[PDB]
């Protein structure tokens, strides 16, 4: 999938890899600040922070920072530190997401006029990449088409100041080659500034196609994909992500609410979303802990390692009303249900102690290859461990176990194992 990168990451790549005749200024002149920053050390590494005034803004995938009061413009270093005091490390709500302001970029202030500000954006669609320019012109660049400076002058720069067309065209042609070479899917510079001294990339927002790592990793390096603002990143997510990378099997985990009492471990992209849909249609969105799925015929050991991560995460703190684990799925096409459920059963066994302490109740529904033995060993571990487990097969509507687990409907023992 296409993943956002920080402004800092995107500018680093652009400064390193763009090829343009245009004189790009302030290359690599940025400094990153967090609540843990050693400001003496920062100033050792970035002495230019004293050379001219500054701009400071969070770099956490927050849009429209200027409209939110979150860009400090034309400040001395002392003015930056004062501007950060009420913000750095504070909770903030942007739109409907809430998180901590904890990652800021400082850059040189660039004096310029309104007429020296430009907008450029490139974004991917099925039919090609659209290139947008505004001082609004937009050009579809087809899948096999080149974008040369003369093309940009003819189709995009008709309204641009005459003295800036050559440098704008060279930059945008370079930008587009960079966008393609590094497998971007979205790249916006708002504003791009061009003065008598050259080109300045004042702002940058971007997404890369993360599946292109096997092609791009020499240029990308150890690229980071930050979570959206309002979510944290967790080591378990990184652990699952590492599993997902090592096999053709798909293993995904996104923590929504680590303290929620409703956990899922569903097979399949589609079904995992339908279960989540059904949980929220039934009131449990504030108690839904996670979204994720496993699919693509993982082994018993991959499914054990996946499941033990979940069971660990849902036995971190108790809940007055205990917890629910939804082990669900469609009728699989090829996943060995017995082999995967044996992985899960072994995880359940290893964690049976903590699982009882947190009053976890388990609901299971699944079809596919070998599923009858899959459902049996689930029923079996329930009796061995004392954990309550209610086990259903193809004869149960896929999502019925959600209503069961939230009390909207009763448990039909007449369908167990069917």
């Amino acid at each position: 999938s296409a993943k956002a990168i920080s402004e800092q990451t995107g500018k680093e790549l652009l400064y390193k890899f763009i090829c343009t005749t245009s004189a790009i200024q302030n290359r690599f002149k940025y400094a990153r600040v967090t609540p843990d920053t050693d400001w003496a050390r920062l100033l050792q590494d970035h002495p230019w922070l004293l050379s001219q005034n500054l701009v400071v803004k969070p770099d956490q995938l927050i849009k429209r920072r200027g409209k939110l009061g979150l860009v400090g413009v034309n400040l001395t270093l002392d003015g930056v530190k004062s501007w950060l005091k009420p913000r750095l490390g504070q909770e903030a709500t942007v739109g409907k997401a809430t998180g901590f302001l904890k990652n800021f970029l400082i850059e040189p202030f660039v004096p310029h006029s309104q007429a020296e500000e430009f907008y450029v954006c490139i974004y991917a669609t099925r039919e090609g990449d659209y290139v947008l320019f505004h001082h609004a012109q937009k050009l579809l660049v087809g899948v096999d088409e080149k974008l040369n400076p003369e093309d940009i002058k003819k189709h995009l720069l008709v309204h641009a100041p005459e003295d800036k067309k050559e440098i704008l065209a060279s930059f945008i042609s370079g930008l587009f080659n960079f966008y393609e070479d590094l497998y971007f899917t979205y790249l916006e510079i708002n504003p791009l500034v061009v003065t008598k001294d050259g080109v300045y990339v004042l702002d940058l927002a971007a997404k890369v196609d993360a599946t292109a790592d096997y092609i791009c990793k020499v240029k990308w390096g150890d690229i980071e994909f930050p979570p959206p603002f309002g979510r944290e990143a967790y080591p378990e997510e990184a652990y699952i992500a590492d599993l997902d990378a090592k096999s053709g099997a798909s293993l995904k985990l996104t923590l929504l609410n680590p303290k929620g009492r409703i956990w899922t471990m569903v097979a399949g992209g589609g079904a995992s979303v339908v279960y989540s849909d059904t949980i929220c249609d039934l009131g449990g969105v504030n108690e839904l802990a996670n979204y994720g799925e496993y699919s693509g015929a993982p082994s018993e050991q991959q499914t054990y390692d996946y499941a033990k991560t979940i069971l660990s995460l849902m036995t971190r703190e108790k809940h007055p009303d205990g917890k629910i684990l939804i082990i669900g799925g469609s009728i699989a096409n090829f996943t060995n249900v017995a082999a995967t459920f044996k992985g899960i059963v072994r995880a359940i066994r290893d964690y049976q102690g903590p699982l009882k302490e947190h009053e976890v109740t388990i609901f299971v529904r699944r079809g596919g290859p070998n599923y009858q033995e899959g459902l049996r060993v689930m029923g079996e571990v329930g009796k061995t461990t004392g954990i309550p487990i209610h086990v259903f097969g193809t004869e149960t509507h896929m999502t019925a176990i959600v209503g069961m687990a939230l009390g909207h409907r009763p448990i039909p023992e007449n369908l167990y194992f069917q």
Binding site: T211, V273, V285, N333
Partner: protein, 324 residues
């Protein structure tokens, strides 16, 4: 789009990859469908030399040739017009481009997940120019009961039998999800005379063939009397259905539900399991798509839980008036 009909009970395929279980599963389905011949004429696997692989046609062991070179497989099997590509993500692009140098191939299924979007767009461009239908990437494939099934679609024989996938009914469907298309097999078989044809277009941002590509095929297929679409958050592909109805191009009843309505209730954006399953603007959400489909005249249930009920209701009205 392109061809209305992709498969028949005479379809022959080449399978790219050493996927003996998938191939045997196809042959098990071929047998209970009463096909004359196995649907897999040959396999291509560059990591071994030419050899023959043992398979079973009912109880009889038979041999299917495995070729190191695609050129040999194509030349020895001119009857083949379908290629099912199980190549890993790293080589799916090159092997699919290579397949499209053979004019005999009119349909390609691309199984692998994780192909870069920019490579898929180039496959789509070559495919559109040649008239080739691509199903995938990132898909299990599809199934045409009585005729042909792609790879692992529909699972083992016991599932093929339980969901009556050995002979066609009157209901066609298209879905983004592979797993959920086997759930649709189940639902449709319990509420109607069964599946006529189903396709899983895969979960990527740019599917080789879109919902509307297949819905148009079904509209133009006389055996199809009604159509079921399982949509998903992300992109705007489903609005082409509203347009087709509005234009009078789509006249058969259409039932649709888009998954991903939970995203509207989260305080932040969530990338779901399928690569394309992420809304970049308000109209790409499941809730917006479902509401627009409903206003255009599609039969939309309140939630996935009522999908079987509305399918059965549409099916029964069509029997009542003599259409089925």
């Amino acid at each position: 789009s392109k061809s209305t009909t992709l498969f028949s009970r005479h379809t022959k395929a080449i399978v790219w990859g050493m996927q003996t279980r998938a191939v045997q599963g196809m042959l098990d389905f071929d047998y209970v469908c009463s096909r004359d011949e196995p649907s897999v004429a040959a396999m291509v696997y560059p990591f071994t030399g030419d050899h023959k692989q043992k398979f079973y046609w009912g109880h009889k062991e038979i041999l299917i040739p495995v070729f190191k070179n695609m050129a040999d497989a194509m030349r020895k099997h001119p009857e083949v017009d379908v290629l099912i590509n199980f190549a890993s993500l790293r080589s799916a692009y090159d092997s699919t481009m290579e397949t499209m140098n053979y004019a005999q191939i009119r349909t390609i299924a691309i199984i692998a997940e994780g192909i870069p979007e920019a490579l898929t767009r180039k496959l789509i461009k070559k495919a559109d120019q040649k008239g080739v239908t691509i199903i995938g990437p990132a898909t299990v494939g599809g199934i045409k009961p009585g005729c042909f099934k792609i790879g692992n679609t529909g699972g083992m024989l016991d599932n093929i039998l339980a969901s009556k996938l050995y002979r066609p009914g009157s209901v066609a469907y298209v879905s983004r999800s592979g797993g959920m298309s086997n759930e649709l097999n189940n639902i449709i078989s319990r509420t109607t005379d069964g599946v006529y044809e189903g396709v899983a277009i895969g979960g990527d941002r740019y599917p080789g063939s879109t919902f509307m590509d297949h819905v148009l095929r079904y509209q133009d297929t006389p055996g199809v009397k009604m159509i079921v679409v399982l949509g998903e958050i992300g992109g705007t592909e489903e609005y082409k259905i509203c347009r087709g109805i509005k234009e009078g191009r789509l006249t058969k009843p259409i039932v649709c539900w888009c998954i991903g309505t939970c995203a509207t209730m989260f305080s932040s954006e969530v990338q779901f399991g399928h690569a394309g399953a992420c809304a970049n603007q308000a109209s790409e959400t499941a809730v917006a798509k479902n509401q627009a489909l409903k206003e255009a005249g599609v039969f939309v249930p309140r939630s996935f839980d009522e999908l079987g009920e509305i399918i059965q209701s549409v099916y029964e009205d069509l029997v009542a008036n003599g259409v089925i």
